[PDB]
Amino acid sequence: TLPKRVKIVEVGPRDGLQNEKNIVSTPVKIKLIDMLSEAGLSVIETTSFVSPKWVPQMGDHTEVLKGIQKFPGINYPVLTPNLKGFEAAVAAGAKEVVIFGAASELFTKKNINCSIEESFQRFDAILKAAQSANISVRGYVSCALGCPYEGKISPAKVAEVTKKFYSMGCYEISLGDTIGVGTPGIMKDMLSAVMQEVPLAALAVHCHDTYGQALANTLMALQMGVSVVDSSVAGLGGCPYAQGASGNLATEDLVYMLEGLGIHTGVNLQKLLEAGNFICQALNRKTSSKVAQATC
Amino acid sequence: TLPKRVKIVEVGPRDGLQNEKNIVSTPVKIKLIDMLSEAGLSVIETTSFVSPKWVPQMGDHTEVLKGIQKFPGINYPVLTPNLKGFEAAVAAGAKEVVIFGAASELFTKKNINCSIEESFQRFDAILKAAQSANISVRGYVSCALGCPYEGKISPAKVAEVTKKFYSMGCYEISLGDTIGVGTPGIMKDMLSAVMQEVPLAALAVHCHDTYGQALANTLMALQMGVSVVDSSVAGLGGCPYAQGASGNLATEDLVYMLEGLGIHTGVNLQKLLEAGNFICQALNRKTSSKVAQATC
Numbered sequence: 261t262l263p264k265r266v267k268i269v270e271v272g273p274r275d276g277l278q279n280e281k282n283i284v285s286t287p288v289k290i291k292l293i294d295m296l297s298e299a300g301l302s303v304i305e306t307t308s309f310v311s312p313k314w315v316p317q318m319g320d321h322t323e324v325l326k327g328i329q330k331f332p333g334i335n336y337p338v339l340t341p342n343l344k345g346f347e348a349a350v351a352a353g354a355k356e357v358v359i360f361g362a363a364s365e366l367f368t369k370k371n372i373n374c375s376i377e378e379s380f381q382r383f384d385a386i387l388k389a390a391q392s393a394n395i396s397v398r399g400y401v402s403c404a405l406g407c408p409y410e411g412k413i414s415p416a417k418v419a420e421v422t423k424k425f426y427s428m429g430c431y432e433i434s435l436g437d438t439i440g441v442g443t444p445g446i447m448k449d450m451l452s453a454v455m456q457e458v459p460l461a462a463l464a465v466h467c468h469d470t471y472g473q474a475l476a477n478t479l480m481a482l483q484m485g486v487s488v489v490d491s492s493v494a495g496l497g498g499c500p501y502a503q504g505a506s507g508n509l510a511t512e513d514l515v516y517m518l519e520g521l522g523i524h525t526g527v528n529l530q531k532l533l534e535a536g537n538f539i540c541q542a543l544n545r546k547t548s549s550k551v552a553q554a555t556c
Numbered sequence: 557t558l559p560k561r562v563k564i565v566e567v568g569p570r571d572g573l574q575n576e577k578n579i580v581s582t583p584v585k586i587k588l589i590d591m592l593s594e595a596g597l598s599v600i601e602t603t604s605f606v607s608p609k610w611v612p613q614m615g616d617h618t619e620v621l622k623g624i625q626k627f628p629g630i631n632y633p634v635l636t637p638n639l640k641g642f643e644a645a646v647a648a649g650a651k652e653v654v655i656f657g658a659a660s661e662l663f664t665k666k667n668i669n670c671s672i673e674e675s676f677q678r679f680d681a682i683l684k685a686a687q688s689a690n691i692s693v694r695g696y697v698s699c700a701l702g703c704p705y706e707g708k709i710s711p712a713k714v715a716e717v718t719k720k721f722y723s724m725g726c727y728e729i730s731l732g733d734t735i736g737v738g739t740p741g742i743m744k745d746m747l748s749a750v751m752q753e754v755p756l757a758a759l760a761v762h763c764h765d766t767y768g769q770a771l772a773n774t775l776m777a778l779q780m781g782v783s784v785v786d787s788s789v790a791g792l793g794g795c796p797y798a799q800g801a802s803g804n805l806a807t808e809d810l811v812y813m814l815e816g817l818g819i820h821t822g823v824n825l826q827k828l829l830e831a832g833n834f835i836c837q838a839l840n841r842k843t844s845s846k847v848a849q850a851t852c
């Protein structure tokens with residue numbers, strides 16, 4: 261059956277802005293984030309404490325985390341790819357961090373020269389450091405429904421890596437269809453294998469709409485009992501590993517569906533559409549949200 | 557559970573084109589339909605035999621039906637609103653016609669001008685003639701998941717109309733979310749009420765993606781056992797009852813989902829994309845197919 265409430269994780273300011281062609285000033289980022297908080301989102305991925313030399317679009321991570329209004333009860337997780345970034349994030353006041361791995365050997369190797377097993381040693385250091393500081397850690401498992409290099413990905417394999425993340429300390433793992441090649445059957449098989457080893461409450465789904473399958477894959481996950489899904493404001497984002505089509509599932513199209521289902525999200529659609537319109541103008545782009553297009 | 561095979565009903569050349577800003581030459585329509593035949597679609601809504609007064613985009617209906625190649629096995633149904641339209645269709649060689657009703661009263665008044673009950677008298681004569689003429693007839697029930705004038709529409713009222721159409725001769729009734737406001741739950745309640753009165757094999761779904769819910773509502777119908785769904789080539793068309801937003805579910809995105817689910821469609825995706833690209837160019841527009849944008 262369908263959950264009664266879904267926790268929506270907004271990734272537009274990080275996953276979205278990181279993979280957008282144009283860049284916006286720090287004040288725009290802070291304003292966009294305050295607008296999503298005003299819209300009622302309970303968790304907003306804010307920035308990434310990664311080297312400016314590798315991903316310059318996230319270069320203002322320290323000032324963004326310190327400049328945003330911290331609404332009551334709302335979580336503002338930040339990405340910390342390594343120990344150095346983790347220490348900076350903590351020093352900047354972060355209370356939740358996010359680490360990312362993959363269920364694909366080829367993807368991991370072409371992204372860090374380390375095998376899936378090796379990537380977990382780098383994670384152990386952060387998780388040990390996070391535990392000593394009482395900081396929460398969310399995990400990202402990319403290529404959960406297919407890899408741009410290996411093609412099909414085994415469910416057992418995704419279950420294996422997710423389990424590792426969870427036993428290592430991550431209170432929540434987001435299974436991501438990074439290139440958007442997944443379809444509901446694939447989603448179903450994957451989650452079925454993951455749920456055997458990880459409790460339902462620790463799972464989240466993050467689907468890309470590159471092939472127009474994002475919302476349908478999310479619904480399958482909801483029918484399977486997942487109660488947390490990642491999405492980006494106006495469908496901002498994209499994937500470096502896929503032809504310049506679309507990226508993240510649009511938060512507005514997701515809440516529209518959830519409200520129709522009678523599922524609580526605690527999100528105000530009108531105010532979410534304002535945030536989307538705002539960032540879209542700052543970026544000189546058209547929103548990828550269909551609800552936004554149909555509303556005005 | 558999910559059916560082993562699905563009959564995709566391509567409506568791009570009629571539904572799609574009738575609801576597009578720009579128009580195209582008769583030779584363009586003909587070639588589009590031949591390309592759609594090439595791609596393997598088993599049923600292609602070819603044109604509409606309606607007055608050029610109302611919709612001039614469909615004026616060339618006679619020459620279009622006569623000029624398109626007739627591939628073995630493929631069906632080329634055409635719309636016939638009044639008895640005179642049905643007259644011309646038969647003469648032009650039509651072997652299948654389409655009559656369109658609506659579960660919404662106000663809608664039947666803005667569309668053609670009469671009572672939902674009165675509109676059944678018209679359909680009777682056509683169905684009667686169609687029976688003498690030996691022509692199979694397909695029905696269209698609009699506002700199946702809501703109306704732009706009445707708002708919510710009851711599953712009972714939809715079940716009522718579908719039942720009337722089915723007992724009156726139609727071998728298949730296409731239930732359509734003309735404004736694309738439906739969500740999975742509404743689709744389920746609707747299908748549920750209709751399936752009580754009409755066998756499943758005679759049901760078809762037609763969902764617009766105006767709010768980005770088309771593929772999800774379609775997945776729900778498939779999960780309910782519906783095995784024929786309507787879609788338009790490159791997401792061609794649009795709803796006259798809303799802003800400048802998308803219209804019909806894009807056929808390429810739907811076969812990608814079906815192929816992903818291992819469901820037989822018999823459609824060649826690459827040739828389908830060729831067809832989509834061909835028409836978008838003639839229309840001087842950008843495809844609304846995500847799959848198209850990701851493939852190239």
Ligand SMILES: O=C(O)CC(O)CC(=O)O
Nearest residue numbers: 308310314315339341360
């Ligand atoms: O975590 C990501 O989604 C991307 C990385 O942080 C940036 C990189 O590609 O190096």
Ligand SMILES: [Mg+2]
Nearest residue numbers: 275468497508
């Ligand atoms: Mg993403």
Ligand SMILES: [Mg+2]
Nearest residue numbers: 571734764804
């Ligand atoms: Mg339509």
